[PDB]
Amino acid sequence: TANPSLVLNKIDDISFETYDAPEISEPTDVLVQVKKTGICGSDIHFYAHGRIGNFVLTKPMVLGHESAGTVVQVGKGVTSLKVGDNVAIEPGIPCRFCDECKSGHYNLCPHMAFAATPNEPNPPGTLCKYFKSPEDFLVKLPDHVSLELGALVEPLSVGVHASKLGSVAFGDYVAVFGAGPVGLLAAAVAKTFGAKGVIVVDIFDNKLKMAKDIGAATHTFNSKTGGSEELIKAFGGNVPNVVLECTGAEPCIKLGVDAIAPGGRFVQVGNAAGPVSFPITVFAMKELTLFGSFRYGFNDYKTAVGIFDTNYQNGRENAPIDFEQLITHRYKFKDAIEAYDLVRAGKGAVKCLIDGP
Amino acid sequence: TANPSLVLNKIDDISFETYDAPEISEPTDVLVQVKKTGICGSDIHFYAHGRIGNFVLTKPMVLGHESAGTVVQVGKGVTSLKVGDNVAIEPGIPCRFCDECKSGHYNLCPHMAFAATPNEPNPPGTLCKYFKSPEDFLVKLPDHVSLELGALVEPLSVGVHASKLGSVAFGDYVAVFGAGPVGLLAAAVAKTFGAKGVIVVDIFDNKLKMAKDIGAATHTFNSKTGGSEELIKAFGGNVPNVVLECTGAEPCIKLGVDAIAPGGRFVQVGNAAGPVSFPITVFAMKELTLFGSFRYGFNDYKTAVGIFDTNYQNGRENAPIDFEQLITHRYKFKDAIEAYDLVRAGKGAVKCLIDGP
Amino acid sequence: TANPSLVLNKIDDISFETYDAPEISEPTDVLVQVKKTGICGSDIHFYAHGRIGNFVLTKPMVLGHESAGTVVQVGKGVTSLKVGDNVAIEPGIPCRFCDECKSGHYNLCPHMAFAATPNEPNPPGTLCKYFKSPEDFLVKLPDHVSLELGALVEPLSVGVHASKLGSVAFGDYVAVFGAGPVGLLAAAVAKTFGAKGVIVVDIFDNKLKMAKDIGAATHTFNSKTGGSEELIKAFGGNVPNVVLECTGAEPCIKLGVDAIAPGGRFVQVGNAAGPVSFPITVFAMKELTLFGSFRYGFNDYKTAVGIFDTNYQNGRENAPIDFEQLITHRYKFKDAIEAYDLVRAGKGAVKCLIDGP
Amino acid sequence: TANPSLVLNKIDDISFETYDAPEISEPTDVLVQVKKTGICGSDIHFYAHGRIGNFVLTKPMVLGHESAGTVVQVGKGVTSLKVGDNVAIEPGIPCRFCDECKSGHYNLCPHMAFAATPNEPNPPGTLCKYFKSPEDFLVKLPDHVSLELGALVEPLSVGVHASKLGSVAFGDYVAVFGAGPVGLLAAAVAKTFGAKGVIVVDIFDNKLKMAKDIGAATHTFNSKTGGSEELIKAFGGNVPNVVLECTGAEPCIKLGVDAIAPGGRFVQVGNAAGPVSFPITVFAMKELTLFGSFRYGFNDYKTAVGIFDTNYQNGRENAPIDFEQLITHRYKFKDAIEAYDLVRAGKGAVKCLIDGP
Ligand SMILES: [Zn+2]
Ligand SMILES: [Zn+2]
Ligand SMILES: [Zn+2]
Ligand SMILES: [Zn+2]
Ligand SMILES: [Zn+2]
Ligand SMILES: [Zn+2]
Ligand SMILES: [Zn+2]
Ligand SMILES: [Zn+2]
């Protein structure tokens, strides 16, 4: 009944506290011992500013939102997990009653309680020992899927939701903008879903080489080389069918619009700091479709975990994409702040994982 | 075998010429005596600059693209029209062979030969006496549908294609931006298709009153009053479900994005002069969908004509929307240049129609 | 805290009992005084056999499933209804947790607790005084929408769900098979949604005349006249675009398949007693699509109530379809069994309504 | 200018004739030397009866419809093939003008001129030396894709069109009924498109073992073992998501409906001799969707050829599915009738290929 936690109290203040362990109350409730936890731009954002958009921090918040754990207790009504399963954690829990939820878009639930987002008490975070989640928001991990990759499920589901919105199908030609963690996993999904070509675009040659090395990308393109024609030439002349915009920057959005084929599908997952200059008219003349993608929805976690399942079922040696390279740093729970400053400093970590207490 | 025509030779030079009448060649070909012709921003655009985007004028071009006529000759294989029917004219003819055509999107045919667009000879224009069109690109006009409204079919099909892309259905709440001709007809389609609310937004009080007067709009809003909350208040508190952007201006695009409901559908039909500042991130966080709409496609003309059919079948007195008010000026073929300068001067004409020779 | 109820105990045994009134427990719970209640083939089915399919009766069941009432009590969290609103009742409540619910298809919830269906205690029925329902499963009734029509919402939602599955849109040509209550309301939806033609098919000339009289059908056809060609001729030569099969009988299914246009949409809402002889190959050669329709889903009730709203907003005198003719008998709660035997005997009632205690 | 051909004159009469070689006329026309040709149930059907449905034979018909050849001549306007490419042949050519064609469904063109179907002269067949086809109805064959498999493209496209109608996507669980050529290729598509499970069902243990051996099926089930529960048990407990019905027989259609998950997608590609007994009501209660699949449409051939492309790009040794086993017999053009009687006798050939003259 004791629970150590990483906590962000105020700006640049991260401390280790110890709260009461969450207790099971609902019959579908499940208690999970968090073992791994990922880190992204949103974790350092609250650390540096305490505000993303209008999400603003007003109380001691418990941290962490890309985690995987082990079931340690279940309620009466749990039928999909026993005590002792490895689970990926879907951090955002919806109301199940609103019209967004009822329509199959708990995605956009206005009462969405997300892990490690502020604002009535603060929705709990996963950088603790004991996390409480409903049964249907944990995905059982296959035996060959690492407890590490369970933390990688969260940014992978973001890419699954996006490629689904873009209706990525066999023989497609997808252009993913941004060779960061999300943009890398997104390219891995497109190729997994059967795309004949997956070109990854960014300005870091190191990140582009990794895209090609893990096998998630068939082509790469450095966007300081030129415009749309060179991107097409770098793609073997194939003109992109879907554009997965994971960057949120004008030069990438602009480049993705000139390059994409008429009638192509353009998914927006990257977030800008504000408004951006947009080529609105060529968008119209090409009859493009812009999909705003926000986090992940129904079946997205299970689908992402299943990507790990089939990718690694015949051994890491025979795995078609080497997702584990996305882990460049590993830290114990004691060294958590050494990990946050590490990612805050941008030392060259694509993804950093922290163990549980 | 003699055909008078309105012709734009060079900038600000519009003259009356007389060319050879088009002759039937293909078995599906149909000759049409053009009787009415509409006028829009694109007609005055070529008049003033001779260039829209990269469509640039290099030869004497025959003018006109929103017309209706009477069948005066048919080929052997014509089975849907006899000599003497009233027809609306779909001005853009595609190749039928390319992958855009074959996929049901002759819309985006790269070989699209549109009427009164330059660039091999110039695709013919409708401001003449005898126009040549394939059989499947004319729509027979019901007896109660005016030969005038047949010219109005062209900007109405633009609104039909747009509301279809937006999947406008019963009980929807649509916000149309721009109370011009296209934006007016677009609102008429949304209400026709069963929208519970159709609010029209612009800055001209005259144009907003006309939207409400012809019955195409249930609400109106002048966009100098305020932002999204006032637009919602002007809509009876109903939050918009679909946004039909017929303006192409930043303040309207910006306003349509804050106002629209999460998961709403946003159709872009207005064209900007260049790039525009876009709220790309709230677009993502709301999981909106942006549809680029470009002209009209399969079944769009027939659907628009059918809107005239059912609107006017039980008499103009019982017609639910008074489309004829959209005709504020009428001109004979001799007074064509007096009509072009009239619309060029912006005297207050919503739509101006010119008779055939 | 006293609640009289109509109850079916065993076959042919219907009695009046008095149980304890349901009490509010959940914060979203709402107590409703049932004022009107409809009757259909399923109510008499359990009366005559006590079994529909594998739904079999094993305990005293409280009866009724097409009702409308008045709010008499609310919980803390209710925000969409105050004490005293007129509501239509959606009788089937889902679990909100299963994958069918989470995907936006509470429709197919395997834990669906429907009103007046057996099989742990029996889900309550509406033929009582005080009914308990969650807030989001009641639809507030506009002031001009009769408390009677609120009971008619249930079979109307069945038709809304069906026409949505069939993607009924403007200018469509719909053929509804079966001029009973459901088939009549289904035709009213198709015409409401903008169908250019709605032909109703059955063998009762009385029922066909009513379809045309209330204005829900533009054409009618008696299926003992002939086959598909006569059905087309009866439709003004227009070939059907959507087929709404509300009958469940072979001759109607067979006729709907020959008549429908290639690529047409065929919705199956009628239920057969067992397997039926089906023209499976012409189905394939025409590239038809068969939609199994089962009850109603998200937004279907609100949409049906909205059909009443807009149909009757400018007065019964100006209402485009006269839904009230569907009420041919009215009974007080005391005379409930006189009403069940009346509909059991098939005296000529299209829909019969019973008041609450 | 001389062209030998296999010809079916009357029932059981197949002879070798020599007609005039087809000459290029249209600028998009292409002349092809047919090198391989497949054989299916439709070829022997016309041989035995001279009638499929209402397709009835009234003249000497030139035979063959599953072929691949080599370009030997092109017209002026050909831009996608040079003289000397290996091509798969799409045998059915549409009008490009009708509403089915214009809507992107040349599939259902009422003027469809298919190869080796009767009824104005007889549309030509591919069992000759020189075949004439438009440019956009040939698919260039990658260098590693056998000229044999080009003949296999035709029954593979049938499976591509079907799995597309069923929206087969990653992680799906597909049940294909019928382990014949079409049903085998259909299973290969489902697994290719990313299905987590592809169970093939038939009554021939030989054919089921081949499904599993070429790797197109993860599970198999012999339908004389039992009903739906055993089919699920044979599938590892996974309940089917899509059902691909390639058989046209009642016991398979019946079994596919009980087995499929609620809301599942059921594609009908097999053809019955007449009407069949159908479980119409469980279809409704499960909210299934029945897709009639008829031949193949836009992009289906290119997609099928691309399946060969990616399947064999890293060598037959590393190919994930061994499509070539589907060729159990090979014949020269002289021994064509020995091949037709061979397949007519049902000696055990899954697919038989005949060389060109
Ligand atoms: Zn993150
Ligand atoms: Zn919610
Ligand atoms: Zn125009
Ligand atoms: Zn084209
Ligand atoms: Zn009922
Ligand atoms: Zn449920
Ligand atoms: Zn075949
Ligand atoms: Zn055609």
Numbering used by the authors:
A (entry chain A), B (entry chain A), C (entry chain A), D (entry chain A): 2 to 120, 125 to 362
Could you give the paper's own sentences about this structure?
Xylitol dehydrogenase (XDH) catalyzes the NAD+-dependent oxidization of xylitol into d-xylulose, and belongs to a zinc-dependent medium-chain dehydrogenase/reductase family. This protein family consists of enzymes with one or two zinc atoms per subunit, among which catalytic zinc is necessary for the activity. Among many XDHs from yeast and fungi, XDH from Pichia stipitis is one of the key enzymes for bioethanol production by lignocellulosic biomass, and possesses only a catalytic zinc atom. Xylitol is then oxidized by xylitol dehydrogenase (XDH; EC 1.1.1.9) to give d-xylulose.
The so-called PsXDHC4 mutant was previously constructed by substituting Ser96, Ser99, and Tyr102 with cysteine residues in the wild-type (WT) enzyme. On the other hand, the introduction of four cysteine residues provided additional zinc-binding sites and significantly increased thermostability. Each monomer contained a bidomain architecture composed of a large “catalytic domain” (Thr2-Val163 and Arg300-Pro362) and a smaller “coenzyme-binding domain” (Gly164-Phe299), with a large cleft separating them. The former consisted of an α/β fold with a similar structure to that in other MDR enzymes, and the latter had the characteristic α/β Rossmann fold. Analytical size-exclusion chromatographic studies demonstrated that PsXDHC4 formed a homotetramer in solution. The four subunits (A–D) in the biological tetramer generated from crystallographic 222 symmetry were regarded as a dimer of identical A/B and C/D dimers. An anomalous difference Fourier map using data collected at the K-edge of zinc (wavelength of 1.280 Å) showed two clear peaks within the electron density map of PsXDHC4. Catalytic zinc was coordinated by interactions with Cys41 (distance of 2.3 Å), His66 (2.3 Å), Glu67 (2.2 Å), and a water molecule (Wat6; 2.6 Å). The second zinc atom was bound within a loop that protruded from the catalytic domain of PsXDHC4, at which it was ligated by the enzyme residues Cys96, Cys99, Cys102, and Cys110 (distance of 2.3 Å). Superimposition to the crystal structures of other MDR enzymes revealed that this zinc atom was equivalent to (inherently bound) structural zinc, and there was no significant difference in their binding loops regardless of zinc.
